[PDB]
DNA sequence: TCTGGGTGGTGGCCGTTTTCGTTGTTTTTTTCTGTCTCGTGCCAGGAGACTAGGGAGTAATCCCCTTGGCGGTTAAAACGCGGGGGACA
DNA sequence: CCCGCGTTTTAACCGCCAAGGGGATTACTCCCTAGTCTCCTGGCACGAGACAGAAAAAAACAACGAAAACGGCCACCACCCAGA
């Protein structure tokens, strides 16, 4: 007898868009991506020790990498008549950029 | 690849004068020993991670000439007297008999008439479904033709012609109760696998509570003074035991003045675990019920073993006519306290003085002896 | 260190789209994410590391980094070189 | 590593040390023996607990070592 | 005996297979021509032998900062329910 | 199928403490590289010759598109069984 107020869908996502285009604070969380370079790093050489500097710096390359890659995937993904991301986009992207074979 | 002689290499007729040792190479820098291969000696990572930074006094080869043969005793001998990964009936896992055809996978115990794993029919197996397919054909007319044959030749059974029928195209299935049978008691509740479990079976701890649990926690509540807090959560107050009606926790300082203290699952009263003497913390299996509750199962001897078990919770079907009270009124030994499955409401007084009468009316009849 | 790529998780994934204008993202994206920043970090890595070995080093610094970077022809301002 | 395995009660030590060495736990202590004998008040004798801590010094010549040893740390800080 | 349902046979329509001719392309033998490969001769860049100097290897010291761990707070991640708008046929 | 909202759980984050590996620097010394003169032989330019390949014409064959035949599905008729 008065339903809650939920907002229509697609709307948070555009208010979440012009918050996160607006800010420039790092997005993924700094423990998992710390712990996710050691772990690659691994597979080259045992007992590598990393300036918090050095991970700070690898994660923002990955961050601008991973944010210019989905601006790229939104622009396939308008492309074919949608407004949904999928993985064929992310892959066409990454085809025409020349990174995938 | 040298061929994998064989080592005899007989040289003229048998003589067998020349050999062919196996090459080892393998079975060797195998690297299974729990750290490098076993002719290798420790690593370089392994020695600076792991550094610090008489055989004529040896009484053992004089054994042999020391031990004598036993034999005493019996001694005589006693000579004398793309596939499914669940089973498709039960639901579980476990080795299956996979269909060539159908997709579905069964146990070995779990077909119609179950099937030995060391003499299996071997070759092809079908699944009932399948072989229902093969002999219908799918088509409509003559699966017709085919069970109203057989209806007509169950005429005696028509009542249950269709039932009938329709058991030879079904796969084997394991029984359970429809939920409009287990809905009539709200505190069972089927398990992960059918481990059909009650309101007596403790929640199960996942692997964070158990296996990530540091020195000092879970099942360590028996390790160190750590859990002191043994202090009433929501209060913050003591857990009083009901028995000593004390709590002990000592000091830091004294450790072993404390004495282990468990919350009942059922009730919520504090027991010193040395007043109900127990050796544990439940933590695992069911749920730790006081001394201080009453009993389900009354098992009675006067052998007459004669069971009486407590009628399992209804759903709110449930009755309760009220009493005119007073002595009789012979429940079972259902009850509902207040100030067909018909769950007495026995109130304060009544309890008073059926006791009172029970116990004086036996006096006076041990009188009668 | 075992499956820290899962530390990556769905809504960090979904706070980096937003920021490239995503409006609505496909369930399948966040694996396919995932996959191309586990390459994109062996693919730099790999170039640090390098870095550090030849300078006789046990800890890879950040201008290692920078310069595998810029290797890769993503230079990085804010980190020194 | 051998004599450190058989430390099972030190190598929680230095922690729990932080935890029950506070204010909060030494209050709870003195406070539980009250209430004890406060239940055994309720549930026994009423009247005759005057005392909930009896902390004895049978040697002298350690409050010098505790002196001492205080003494040094203000010199360092 | 008549009507309805189901099965079997015959006819019609649709789909698939083949069946055929037609271009387009590939393969094969002959021709011939111009660039690849080899040789000759000269020269200038590489080699050899030697001296001088300092860049870097190596040992020693030290002081940063990278690692590890531990506890408390709580922000974020997860899991679930529900619906509608977007994918897609 | 994915967005949105809500409990519920997890662990990230902060901060604080303890330890030491390794970055960074300094001093010593030598072995390696620059430099230079003399020697020469490998590499380059030029000339040549001939055979690998381009071309080409002709035949073979190997992808593209129509009517008949076979098979499958649907409709209609005939026969048999079941019901009225
Ligand atoms: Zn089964
Ligand atoms: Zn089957
Ligand atoms: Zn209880
Ligand atoms: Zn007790």
């Known amino acids: 007898v008065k339903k809650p107020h939920r907002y229509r869908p697609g709307t948070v996502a555009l208010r979440e868009?012009?918050?996160?285009?607006?800010?420039?604070?790092?997005?993924?969380?700094?423990?998992?991506?710390?712990?996710?370079?050691?772990?690659?790093?691994?597979?080259?050489?045992?007992?590598?020790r990393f300036q918090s500097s050095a991970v700070m710096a690898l994660?923002?390359?990955?961050?601008?990498?991973?944010?210019?890659?989905?601006?790229?995937?939104?622009?396939?993904?308008?492309?074919?008549?949608?407004?949904?991301?999928?993985?064929?986009?992310?892959?066409?992207?990454?085809?025409?950029?020349?990174?995938?074979? | 690849e040298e061929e994998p002689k064989e080592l005899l290499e007989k040289d003229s007729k048998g003589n067998i004068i020349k050999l062919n040792e196996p090459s080892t190479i393998s079975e060797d820098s195998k690297v299974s020993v729990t750290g490098l291969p076993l002719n290798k000696g420790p690593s370089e990572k392994i020695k600076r991670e792991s550094l610090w930074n008489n055989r004529n006094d040896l009484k053992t080869f004089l054994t042999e000439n020391m031990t004598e043969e036993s034999?005493?005793?019996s001694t005589i001998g006693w000579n004398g007297d793309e596939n499914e990964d669940f089973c498709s009936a039960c639901n579980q896992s476990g080795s299956f008999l996979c269909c060539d055809t159908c997709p579905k996978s069964f146990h070995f115990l779990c077909?119609?008439?179950?099937?030995?794993?060391?003499?299996?029919?071997?070759?092809?197996?079908?699944?009932?479904?399948?072989?229902?397919?093969?002999?219908?054909?799918?088509?409509?007319?003559?699966?017709?033709?085919?069970?109203?044959?057989?209806?007509?030749?169950?005429?005696?059974?028509?009542?249950?012609?269709?039932?009938?029928?329709?058991?030879?195209?079904?796969?084997?299935?394991?029984?359970?109760?429809?939920?409009?049978?287990?809905?009539?008691?709200?505190?069972?509740?089927?398990g992960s696998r059918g481990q059909y479990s009650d309101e007596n079976d403790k929640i199960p701890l996942t692997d964070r509570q158990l296996f990530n649990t540091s020195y000092g926690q879970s099942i360590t509540k028996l390790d160190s003074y750590n859990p002191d807090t043994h202090i009433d959560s929501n209060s913050g107050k003591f857990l009083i035991?009901?028995?000593?009606?004390?709590?002990?926790?000592?000091?830091?300082?004294?450790?072993?003045?404390?004495?282990?203290?468990?919350?009942?699952?059922?009730?919520?009263?504090?027991?010193?675990?040395?007043?109900?003497?127990?050796?544990?913390?439940?933590?695992?299996?069911?749920?730790?019920?006081?001394?201080?509750?009453?009993?389900?199962?009354?098992?009675?001897?006067?052998?007459?073993?004669?069971?009486?078990?407590?009628?399992?919770?209804?759903?709110?079907?449930?009755?309760?006519?009220?009493?005119?009270?007073?002595?009789?009124?012979?429940?079972?030994?259902?009850?509902?306290?207040?100030?067909?499955?018909?769950?007495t409401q026995i109130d304060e007084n009544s309890i008073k003085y059926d006791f009172f009468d029970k116990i004086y009316k036996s006096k006076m009849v041990q009188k009668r002896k | 260190l075992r499956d820290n790529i899962q530390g990556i998780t769905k809504p960090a994934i979904?706070?980096?789209?937003?920021?490239?204008?995503?409006?609505?993202?496909?369930?399948?994206?966040?694996?396919?994410?995932?996959?191309?920043?586990?390459?994109?970090?062996?693919?730099?890595?790999?170039?640090?590391?390098?870095y550090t070995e030849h300078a006789k080093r046990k800890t890879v610094t950040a201008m290692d980094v920078v310069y595998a970077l810029?290797?890769?022809?993503?230079?990085?301002?804010?980190?020194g070189g | 590593v051998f004599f450190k395995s058989l430390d099972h009660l030190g190598l929680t030590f230095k922690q729990a040390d932080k935890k029950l060495l506070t204010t909060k736990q030494l209050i709870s202590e003195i406070s539980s023996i009250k209430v004890d004998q406060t239940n055994?008040?309720?549930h026994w004798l009423t009247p005759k607990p005057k005392s909930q801590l009896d902390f004895d010094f049978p040697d002298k010549n350690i409050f010098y070592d505790i002196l001492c040893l205080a003494d040094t740390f203000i010199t360092h800080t």
């Open chain 2, 111 to 190: 077909l119609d008439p179950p099937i030995d794993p060391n003499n299996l029919p071997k070759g092809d197996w079908h699944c009932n479904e399948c072989k229902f397919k093969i002999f219908i054909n799918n088509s409509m007319a003559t699966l017709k033709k085919i069970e109203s044959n057989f209806i007509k030749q169950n005429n005696n059974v028509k009542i249950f012609a269709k039932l009938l029928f329709n058991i030879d195209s079904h796969n084997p299935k394991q029984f359970q109760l429809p939920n409009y049978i287990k809905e009539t008691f709200p505190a069972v509740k089927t």
């Open chain 2, 71 to 73: 034999n005493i005793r």
């Open chain 4, 40 to 42: 055994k008040k309720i």
């Open chain 2, 241 to 343: 035991c009901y028995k000593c009606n004390q709590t002990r926790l000592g000091s830091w300082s004294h450790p072993e003045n404390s004495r282990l203290i468990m919350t009942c699952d059922y009730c919520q009263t504090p027991w010193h675990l040395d007043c109900v003497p127990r050796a544990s913390f439940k933590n695992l299996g069911s749920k730790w019920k006081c001394p201080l509750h009453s009993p389900t199962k009354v098992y009675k001897k006067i052998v007459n073993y004669k069971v009486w078990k407590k009628q399992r919770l209804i759903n709110k079907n449930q009755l309760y006519y009220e009493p005119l009270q007073k002595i009789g009124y012979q429940n079972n030994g259902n009850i509902q306290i207040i100030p067909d499955f018909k769950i």
């Open chain 3, 14 to 50: 979904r706070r980096l789209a937003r920021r490239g204008g995503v409006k609505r993202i496909s369930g399948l994206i966040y694996e396919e994410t995932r996959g191309v920043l586990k390459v994109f970090l062996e693919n730099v890595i790999r170039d640090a590391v390098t």
């Open chain 3, 70 to 79: 810029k290797r890769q022809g993503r230079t990085l301002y804010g980190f």
């Open chain 1, 59 to 101: 994660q923002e390359a990955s961050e601008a990498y991973l944010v210019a890659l989905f601006e790229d995937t939104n622009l396939c993904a308008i492309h074919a008549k949608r407004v949904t991301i999928m993985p064929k986009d992310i892959q066409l992207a990454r085809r025409i950029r020349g990174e995938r074979a």
């Open chain 1, 17 to 48: 868009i012009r918050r996160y285009q607006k800010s420039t604070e790092l997005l993924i969380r700094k423990l998992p991506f710390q712990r996710l370079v050691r772990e690659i790093a691994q597979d080259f050489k045992t007992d590598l």
